[PDB]
Amino acid sequence: STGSATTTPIDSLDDAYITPVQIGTPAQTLNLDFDTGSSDLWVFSSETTASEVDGQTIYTPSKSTTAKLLSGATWSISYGDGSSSSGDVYTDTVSVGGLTVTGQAVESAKKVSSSFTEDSTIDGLLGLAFSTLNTVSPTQQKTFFDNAKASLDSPVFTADLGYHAPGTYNFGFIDTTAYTGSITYTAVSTKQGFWEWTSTGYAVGSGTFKSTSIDGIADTGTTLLYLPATVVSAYWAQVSGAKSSSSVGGYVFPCSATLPSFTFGVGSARIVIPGDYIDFGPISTGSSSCFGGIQSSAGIGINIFGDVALKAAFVVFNGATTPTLGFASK
Template sequence: MHSTTALIAALAAVSLPQSQAKPIEARQLGGLGAAIGGTVDSAAGSGNTGGTVGSILDTTVSGTTDSTVDTLNNAVGAVQGFTLQQEEYGKRLKNGPIALGNLYKKFDVDMPDDVYDAFDVATQSQPPNELNKRAAAATSSVKTSTLSSSVKPTSSSIATTSSKVSSTTVAIATKPKPTGGSATATPVNQFDTAYMIAIKVGGNTVYVDLDTGSSDLWVFSNQQPSAQTQKHNIYSPSPSKLMQGYSWNVTYLDGSTAAGNVYNDTVTLGNMNFTGQAVEAAQYASDAFVAASYDGMLGLAFDSLNTVKPKQQRTLFNSIASQLPKPLFTSLLKHNAPGSYDFGYVDTTKYTGAITYANVSTANGWWQFTSQGYSVGSGAAVSQAVSAVVDTGTTLMVMPSNIVNAYYAKVAGAGYSSAYGAWVYPCASSMPNFNLIVNGAAQTIPGNLMTYGPIDYNGNCYGGLQANDNIGVAILGTIFIKSQYVIYDQSTNPPRVGFAKQAGLSYN
């Protein structure tokens, strides 16, 4: 066996710990040559081959240079793939009206009047630094609203039931118009843990949100005013890496914007270094981004959504896909716990049962597929084709109104609130599972994961499932994704998305 071939084969056989968003260091490689040498002996059938490879590698490691480590990292990654592990990184506000408004803004769709009014009040009532903050603990000084109103229950019959929804009303806090310095009352547990991914751009570590619904890699940088970067890790690019004449501008989340220059630089993901990547350095970011718990976004949708001008750039994933064992990545996001993304391989220990695949349409640049139906709890499946987008950058799940109505018909005390532009219900209500039918298999969200969070001090909750009025497609945000092991696979034509049950998660 040729020595280079033997080395690659050996690297394939040696089991190295999966990275947690940091590259292999030279001190981790001591004695690796001996281990690989033994492996090469077995593969080549010659002790001399293994000894030679092992000796060369250990000699190289003894005086390890950055380029040597990079070569080893990428050789291992090209055979094994790599993992990015989420880390706890501050807190983010759980505000239902803002979350739903964010979704409409991100997909550039006009909000229904109720949704817009609720979003407008919520964003004006919350100081910018409270919208999405990096903080050790939530504040608890917000005063409780003494006003209340009833929730408007649906009065239309649902296809899956012969009875109408109960007319029981739920007392909720109204959303008063902001006056002076007052703020809309929000629950004491209005903050949720934010989980981010650490990557390196150039020589700087930043924490980013991986977003399958956008296609830009942008980060806070030293080119912004200092007031915008005080609470962020920043990218300090070398002027020599500037892509002359290139710029970018993104608008998403709550309609906030960020813009800046583009650099050709090295990006480190897990234990692999990728040179020649388009890194978008912010020169400006609006208040919501400044107050956010992340230092940037890593978009994992398709190239057509990239905002760089005058020529769109490939997404980071598409740029590195040829260097991976397989051109795919997976997400394992969890409820109240850090999750992970695997690149280049499918980890069979992270899911149970079969994987169900669906073909993806890339016409809109999203991971978009068609589901064939749904069911609620133990009820019968209802046939209904729905075009859906898998989006890790969106919190809620939105579906056609008739599906949403059918679900909340099975939730005691649930009703539509015109005050919040959304479905709410008593937090104590028992929530049924929701099953999305994909190619004959039910992709289940356990009922206990269907709630977004409390909406007031009266014991009411904001539903994680809401109507997709005006949007035209269903959006499967983290309410859905946190119950699934998801595979985003570009090894097929067309690409495909796969779903399986998470290992260790109860679906009863």
């Protein structure tokens, strides 16, 4: 089997991407944030504290004839930005782009933090990291991908995110019309539960390529590109007037600037992030200071190849017995 679904930026800046997901019987369609950096499928629901729901579409398990309470199971998650959610768990039928999993753990939110409430466009998350990160207790649950894997034509999914445009998540097959040249595959470590790999280096604009190992994770659920301070300093040094601002919380630059591209290495291959991809617009409405799409990972503990990097490529998440990652230009 295979699945194929369009993913759409939630706003003009590509701050996140949402993908329609069918849950339950009859189908209830929610727009979820596909996140290769976590491993819980959780949704706004009829159980979510009323004051914490503001415009989201909710899952109502009592209206699904295939929903079953997973007795005694609870979940609680906190993300890198300080946001959080928690609740209980149902199993139900979940379909993505024509691909159906029965008995999927659907984590129903009783509580969500303010940042989730404030984002009316995201009805929940669908985690695509490794199932070892799933927060369901006392019995850990599998991801949608993990559950689907045996039935898929090939044990893979691919991320094809658009720049200011829709893109595609495919399951079970590689669309050879969706990229240019060849796909370069690279080793993955699952030891932290992430799609963790090692980039071979970087270049800034037309500058010379610096060969250097950069360990990080392929994370669709993170908007920006977070890299070592040395690397990030080298990038923003090429932009007149750019600077790190503690009050804003990262590198900003004059909105009148033309940003240089950023190249990252995948083995011997190179993925080029165009300058425009790195512009995340005025820090506040009407400001002439713009927020940068490449930021320091110094205060994170890990480097993160988020959407800024991933949208520049066709990305293969290969979930074979030994998982790997593939990158192609497009």
